Amino acid sequence: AEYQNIFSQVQVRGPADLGMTEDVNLANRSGVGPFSTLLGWFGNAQLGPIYLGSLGVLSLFSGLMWFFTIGIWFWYQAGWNPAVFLRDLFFFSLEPPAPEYGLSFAAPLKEGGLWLIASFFMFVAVWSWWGRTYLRAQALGMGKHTAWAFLSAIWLWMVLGFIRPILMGSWSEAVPYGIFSHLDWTNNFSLVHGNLFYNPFHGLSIAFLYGSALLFAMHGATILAVSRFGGERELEQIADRGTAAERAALFWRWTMGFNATMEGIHRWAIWMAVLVTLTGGIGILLSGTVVDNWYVWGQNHG
Amino acid sequence: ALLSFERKYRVPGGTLVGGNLFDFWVGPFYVGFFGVATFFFAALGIILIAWSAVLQGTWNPQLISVYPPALEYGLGGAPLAKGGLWQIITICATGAFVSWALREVEICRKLGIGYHIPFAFAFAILAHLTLVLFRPVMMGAWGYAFPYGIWTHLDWVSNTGYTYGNFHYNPAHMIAISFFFTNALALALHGALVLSAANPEKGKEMRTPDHEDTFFRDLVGYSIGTLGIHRLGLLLSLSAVFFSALCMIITGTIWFDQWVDWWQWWVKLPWWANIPGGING
Amino acid sequence: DLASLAIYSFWIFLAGLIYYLQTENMREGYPLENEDGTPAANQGPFPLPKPKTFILPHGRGTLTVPGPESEDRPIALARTAVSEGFPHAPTGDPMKDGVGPASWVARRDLPELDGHGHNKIKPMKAAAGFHVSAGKNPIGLPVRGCDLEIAGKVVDIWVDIPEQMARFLEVELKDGSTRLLPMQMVKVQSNRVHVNALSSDLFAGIPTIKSPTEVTLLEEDKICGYVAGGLMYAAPKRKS
Numbered sequence: 170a171e172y173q174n175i176f177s178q179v180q181v182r183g184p185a186d187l188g189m190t191e192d193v194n195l196a197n198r199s200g201v202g203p204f205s206t207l208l209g210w211f212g213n214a215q216l217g218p219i220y221l222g223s224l225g226v227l228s229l230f231s232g233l234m235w236f237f238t239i240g241i242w243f244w245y246q247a248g249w250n251p252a253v254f255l256r257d258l259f260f261f262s263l264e265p266p267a268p269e270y271g272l273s274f275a276a277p278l279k280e281g282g283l284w285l286i287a288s289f290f291m292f293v294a295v296w297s298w299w300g301r302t303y304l305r306a307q308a309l310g311m312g313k314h315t316a317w318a319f320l321s322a323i324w325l326w327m328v329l330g331f332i333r334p335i336l337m338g339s340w341s342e343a344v345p346y347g348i349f350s351h352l353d354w355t356n357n358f359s360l361v362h363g364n365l366f367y368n369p370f371h372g373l374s375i376a377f378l379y380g381s382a383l384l385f386a387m388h389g390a391t392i393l394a395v396s397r398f399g400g401e402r403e404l405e406q407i408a409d410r411g412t413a414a415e416r417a418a419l420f421w422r423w424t425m426g427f428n429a430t431m432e433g434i435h436r437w438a439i440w441m442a443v444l445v446t447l448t449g450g451i452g453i454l455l456s457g458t459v460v461d462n463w464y465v466w467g468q469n470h471g
Numbered sequence: 472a473l474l475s476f477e478r479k480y481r482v483p484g485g486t487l488v489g490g491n492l493f494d495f496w497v498g499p500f501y502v503g504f505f506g507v508a509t510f511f512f513a514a515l516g517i518i519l520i521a522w523s524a525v526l527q528g529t530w531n532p533q534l535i536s537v538y539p540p541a542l543e544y545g546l547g548g549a550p551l552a553k554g555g556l557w558q559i560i561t562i563c564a565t566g567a568f569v570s571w572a573l574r575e576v577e578i579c580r581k582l583g584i585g586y587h588i589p590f591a592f593a594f595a596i597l598a599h600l601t602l603v604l605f606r607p608v609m610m611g612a613w614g615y616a617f618p619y620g621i622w623t624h625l626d627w628v629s630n631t632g633y634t635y636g637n638f639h640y641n642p643a644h645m646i647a648i649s650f651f652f653t654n655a656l657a658l659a660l661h662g663a664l665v666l667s668a669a670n671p672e673k674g675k676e677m678r679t680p681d682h683e684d685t686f687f688r689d690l691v692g693y694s695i696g697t698l699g700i701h702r703l704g705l706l707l708s709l710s711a712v713f714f715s716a717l718c719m720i721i722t723g724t725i726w727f728d729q730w731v732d733w734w735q736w737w738v739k740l741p742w743w744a745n746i747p748g749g750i751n752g
Numbered sequence: 753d754l755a756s757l758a759i760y761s762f763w764i765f766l767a768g769l770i771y772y773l774q775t776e777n778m779r780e781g782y783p784l785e786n787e788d789g790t791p792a793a794n795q796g797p798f799p800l801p802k803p804k805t806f807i808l809p810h811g812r813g814t815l816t817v818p819g820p821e822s823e824d825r826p827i828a829l830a831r832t833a834v835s836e837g838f839p840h841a842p843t844g845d846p847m848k849d850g851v852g853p854a855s856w857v858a859r860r861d862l863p864e865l866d867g868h869g870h871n872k873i874k875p876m877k878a879a880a881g882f883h884v885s886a887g888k889n890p891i892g893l894p895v896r897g898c899d900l901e902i903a904g905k906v907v908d909i910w911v912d913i914p915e916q917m918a919r920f921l922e923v924e925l926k927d928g929s930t931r932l933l934p935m936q937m938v939k940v941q942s943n944r945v946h947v948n949a950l951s952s953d954l955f956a957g958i959p960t961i962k963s964p965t966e967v968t969l970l971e972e973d974k975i976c977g978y979v980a981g982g983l984m985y986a987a988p989k990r991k992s
């Protein structure tokens with residue numbers, strides 16, 4: 170066996186690394202967490218520090234509130250019985266208001282009110298988490314790519330739980346909080362819209378989802394294949410092309426007739442991924458607002 | 472015809488079969504014995520598809536569809552116009568995929584790089600073989616395979632899944648999906664991170680991988696690192712396809728009822744099976 | 753119909769994105785060239801993008817790409833055929849001349865630096881606080897080449913300080929000088945470090961570093977190129 174570089178043969182530790190400072194407010198960083206030797210076979214061994222300023226606390230607080238609101242409902246459905254709680258965990262479900270409440274807050278707690286409370290908490294958890302994504306990059310002087318990409322995922326989420334429900338005139342359209350119930354909702358969504366396999370945005374979203382696995386398999390394997398020339402030091406390969414970056418390009422040029430650069434592969438990357446949820450949100454948002462049945466729409470539209 | 476840096480790498484050697492016979496390029500493409508093999512298998516397959524097109528009616532890409540033998544034929548051969556073209560085309564397809572992997576191996580050897588790419592591609596090929604070969608064979612007929620057509624192959628996915636109820640409930644499929652979604656999450660984060668470092672705020676100097684580790688420690692308390700993230704994308708991807716192939720090879724063979732009912736093993740565990748309340752009592 | 757509009761727009765967007773992305777990926781290695789280094793007539797249908805400039809940290813200057821491309825080193829290879837598309841044969845020893853899978857690029861002859869401006873990679877003995885934390889410590893093991901002959905002994909690990917990882921083993925030879933070996937090209941075993949790519953006699957030919965406690969990008973490329981090259985060129989002396 171050549172060694173394959175999937176796991177490290179030797180770990181090496183030094184002083185806890187407290188990171189770069191730039192414009193970060195340091196009063197907001199924890200200290201370092203412990204070191205995981207377990208993790209260190211595969212990635213970095215070090216845990217933390219983490220930064221938690223105000224927006225981070227806010228986000229984490231609603232996040233947990235969203236989670237606890239759901240879990241209290243679950244416990245209730247379980248009749249406060251721990252054994253029934255574990256037995257039926259995947260079956261419980263926090264459902265939105267029935268259609269007749271429309272977009273209002275008039276519905277009872279036990280029949281939608283709670284769903285709206287949990288959703289409110291989710292809304293602020295995520296958008297504050299987005300803000301934090303933008304802010305931690307700014308403090309460090311970095312591009313805003315992470316936040317722009319996160320926004321593509323937030324787009325699908327918004328469409329599912331907020332924008333499409335509002336356009337359709339009721340909260341009853343949104344996704345319930347439960348393990349099995351959300352799968353049921355997904356299957357139902359497709360049946361009721363005459364089979365999402367005919368939504369061309371759905372087909373596109375799939376091509377990107379498969380394409381992301383294709384591309385990360387390609388890229389992950391490529392970088393490991395040239396890691397014996399320092400391939401994974403991609404920033405310095407961008408600044409000053411090495412043999413790693415040349416052998417990687419040429420593997421692809423010789424295989425399929427064209428290739429990327431060390432920087433440009435990351436642009437192929439971010440876009441293959443982001444287009445999953447972008448075309449996805451479009452396909453969902455059109456469903457039942459403009460197109461009631463995709464099989465039908467497809468008969469009229471190539 | 473060459474990249475500016477390309478010449479020094481185009482030396483003889485690396486080939487697995489043929490010595491120097493096919494050791495050359497056409498424009499950008501390396502050839503090798505396995506480039507000849509892939510051209511042959513692929514050209515034949517495409518020809519037979521064009522033939523099969525005629526035997527069926529159309530030249531519309533949205534209509535051309537090549538169906539395997541009907542179930543009546545079992546695992547035997549079949550007249551060409553009734554499933555045989557399919558069988559031959561399937562052999563061509565596999566022949567082309569495996570040839571393409573082996574040609575990728577030849578390019579690795581010439582370039583002095585590891586074999587991770589063909590090794591990864593082999594997982595795609597195995598999933599394909601699961602659908603067209605392993606599963607049909609375990610089930611007793613070619614006709615359980617999917618047909619080759621843009622839209623008809625989707626019909627088969629939908630039909631096959633609804634044979635077992637909502638296919639969401641297949642637990643290996645759950646894991647597969649999880650890997651797909653996580654892979655795409657990782658891929659977005661990866662591309663975004665490197666680019667955010669290489670393209671910083673206007674006028675600033677390029678960041679370093681230290682900034683990349685810092686960004687992520689700041690954000691979630693952990694950073695997997697620049698080796699790790701490439702390990703991770705490769706693993707998430709291959710694990711998605713591995714579980715995909717798993718979720719299908721077990722369906723119609725060891726499990727053939729409605730997948731939602733499989734989950735009863737959990738709810739019927741003696742300690743809690745009969746306790747009243749909740750959803751299942 | 754709104755959904756028709758959206759899909760038609762989307763395909764047009766996608767065409768533009770692909771164009772944008774492919775031109776972004778032409779910032780290195782282009783314009784294409786003929787085997788003799790002049791511009792090829794057929795550049796394909798995508799033009800070069802407008803230059804961008806990266807600002808390098810620590811006063812290292814700048815990179816603008818695309819820019820004038822050049823190998824900046826002699827390439828000891830010759831045509832084996834009278835037309836395009838065939839291999840180019842080494843004119844001397846391809847390991848020593850650094851071509852084929854032994855190639856290296858003329859990277860800058862400075863060391864990579866961390867975000868603090870310190871040398872990114874250091875021998876561990878000069879790395880304050882750094883030690884092996886898990887797995888077999890290779891320091892002290894004999895080093896075996898693919899000829900099953902002992903080539904030397906590991907005398908340290910060169911580590912990446914900011915990323916906390918092992919990058920090279922420093923191996924001492926019979927003459928008491930040392931060489932770096934890429935961590936991805938060695939197998940650490942309980943009694944031994946084994947090196948598949950090189951036979952024992954090829955260890956002395958590993959390119960040497962000019963200062964004993966740092967390695968430059970140029971040196972890393974020569975070392976990594978050279979050892980990866982042994983997979984093809986050592987082969988007369990590999991038995992598994």
Ligand code: BCL
Binds near residue numbers: 326344355644
């Ligand atoms: C896309 C179309 C459907 C949909 C269709 C499916 C299908 C189909 C499947 C899933 C599956 C999953 N979906 Mg869903 N899913 C949708 C939208 C969502 C949303 C959301 C906020 O919009 C969430 C949070 C989830 C969450 C989940 C997870 C339970 C699971 C693994 C996801 C994953 O790998 O993510 C990315 C990976 C990460 C590691 C990020 C963080 C991971 C954790 C696990 C997120 C889940 C937390 C959640 C609160 C559960 C814990 C509660 C209990 C203690 C167990 N889905 C929409 C409505 N989803 C799979 C499954 O296993 O279902 C049971 C599955 O087969």
Ligand code: BCL
Binds near residue numbers: 371376517617621625
């Ligand atoms: C994988 C699980 C299912 C399946 C479920 C689905 C579903 C569900 C969807 C598709 C969709 C697609 N699938 Mg399918 N598909 C299967 C197996 C295959 C196989 C195969 C040889 O095994 C192929 C070649 C295809 C090809 C395709 C495409 C027509 C389309 C976009 C895929 C993509 O971008 O992926 C990622 C790869 C890339 C981005 C790289 C480019 C790949 C190109 C586009 C492949 C073109 C193939 C060509 C049209 C036919 C052969 C060409 C010549 C004969 C040589 N599927 C199996 C049976 N497939 C989507 C679609 O729009 O269908 C109409 C869709 O919604």
Ligand code: BCL
Binds near residue numbers: 294323355359371450
């Ligand atoms: C019977 C079921 C229907 C079907 C119904 C649907 C429905 C309905 C939808 C999809 C959607 C999708 N389906 Mg479909 N789908 C079918 C068959 C398929 C098949 C197949 C081979 O058969 C495949 C491969 C797919 C693939 C896909 C994906 C391309 C797409 C979801 C992308 C995504 O990343 O979402 C996962 C990502 C998200 C959900 C974004 C989540 C972002 C938020 C911000 C995360 C919050 C995290 C939260 C706070 C919890 C944190 C906990 C942490 C631990 C801290 N479907 C059949 C026809 N499918 C989605 C779509 O876009 O359709 C166009 C969708 O809504």
Ligand code: BCL
Binds near residue numbers: 356568631648
């Ligand atoms: C109504 C339909 C059912 C359902 C029924 C099925 C069925 C049936 C199947 C899946 C399979 C899958 N489903 Mg499901 N699925 C449903 C809902 C979903 C949802 C969702 C959000 O609701 C999602 C995300 C998924 C996701 C998934 C994946 C786990 C998996 C598809 C990937 C794969 O196998 O790749 C593997 C990749 C390949 C097979 C590609 C091989 C490529 C080859 C090697 C090379 C191609 C070369 C080519 C010809 C190109 C040449 C030309 C060049 C372009 C120049 N399903 C619903 C509930 N699902 C499939 C699976 O697991 O397959 C094993 C499967 O068969």
Ligand SMILES: CC[C@H]1c2cc3[nH]c4c(c3C)C(=O)[C@H](C(=O)OC)c4c3nc(cc4[nH]c(cc(n2)[C@@H]1C)c(C(C)=O)c4C)[C@@H](C)[C@@H]3CCC(=O)OC/C=C(\C)CCC[C@@H](C)CCC[C@@H](C)CCCC(C)C
Binds near residue numbers: 228316320
């Ligand atoms: C581009 C498309 C892909 C995408 C991109 C994407 N997602 C993103 C990003 C990006 C670019 C981020 O930057 C952001 C991030 O920070 O990632 C690390 C993120 C993110 N995507 C996430 C999840 C997610 N993304 C998904 C999908 C996708 N993301 C797409 C495939 C999915 C799917 C497939 O369903 C999920 C589930 C998060 C990890 C993160 C957004 C985090 C966020 O908004 O947090 C708000 C909530 C909280 C801060 C707290 C909630 C805590 C509770 C849920 C409990 C904790 C866990 C519990 C199980 C144990 C502890 C509890 C005990 C007290 C009992």
Ligand SMILES: CC[C@H]1c2cc3[nH]c4c(c3C)C(=O)[C@H](C(=O)OC)c4c3nc(cc4[nH]c(cc(n2)[C@@H]1C)c(C(C)=O)c4C)[C@@H](C)[C@@H]3CCC(=O)OC/C=C(\C)CCC[C@@H](C)CCC[C@@H](C)CCCC(C)C
Binds near residue numbers: 383593
């Ligand atoms: C295993 C993880 C993911 C993966 C990995 C992966 N794929 C790969 C690789 C790797 C590592 C390559 O190295 C190789 C490559 O060269 O990429 C550019 C490749 C590849 N994966 C490809 C496609 C592909 N991969 C897919 C998926 C995946 N690939 C997984 C998600 C899919 C999906 C999801 O559907 C597709 C369609 C190609 C771009 C390329 C391999 C090209 C190849 O084999 O060329 C030789 C063969 C031909 C040129 C054509 C053969 C044609 C005929 C024989 C007849 C047609 C057959 C028939 C099956 C048609 C079906 C019609 C459809 C409508 C259903």
Ligand SMILES: COC(C)(C)C(=O)C/C=C(\C)CC/C=C(\C)CC/C=C(\C)CCCC/C(C)=C/CC[C@@H](C)CC/C=C(\C)CCC=C(C)C
Binds near residue numbers: 240344
């Ligand atoms: C152990 O017990 C305790 C109590 C400790 C627990 O805490 C246990 C907790 C649990 C067991 C909780 C388990 C949680 C789940 C199973 C949740 C699973 C959730 C999903 C599968 C979510 C899928 C999709 C969710 C979506 C699409 C949400 C979209 C929501 C947003 C778009 C929100 C929109 C906002 C609204 C509607 C608010 C409107 C009002 C305003 C004023 C804005």
Ligand SMILES: CCCCCCCCCCCC[N+](C)(C)[O-]
Binds near residue numbers: 368369372373437440
């Ligand atoms: C950033 C990379 C772009 C890759 C694009 C691949 C497109 C695949 C074709 C899917 C066909 C979808 N549709 C709706 C016409 O059915």
Ligand SMILES: CCCCCCCCCCCC[N+](C)(C)[O-]
Binds near residue numbers: 425427796
């Ligand atoms: C849907 C996939 C389309 C295939 C894309 C493959 C492009 C390869 C281009 C080869 C370039 C060769 N040449 C002589 C034109 O330079």
Ligand SMILES: CCCCCCCCCCCC[N+](C)(C)[O-]
Binds near residue numbers: 764765766768769772
């Ligand atoms: C035919 C024109 C259609 C428009 C397509 C536009 C694609 C541009 C892709 C985004 C480029 C990213 N950038 C430069 C803004 O950072």
Ligand SMILES: CCCCCCCCCCCC[N+](C)(C)[O-]
Binds near residue numbers: 426427770774797
């Ligand atoms: C789905 C992704 C397909 C993207 C295909 C775009 C490839 C263009 C190939 C151009 C290469 C031309 N060349 C060799 C002259 O550089």
Ligand SMILES: [Fe+3]
Binds near residue numbers: 388661
């Ligand atoms: Fe990368």
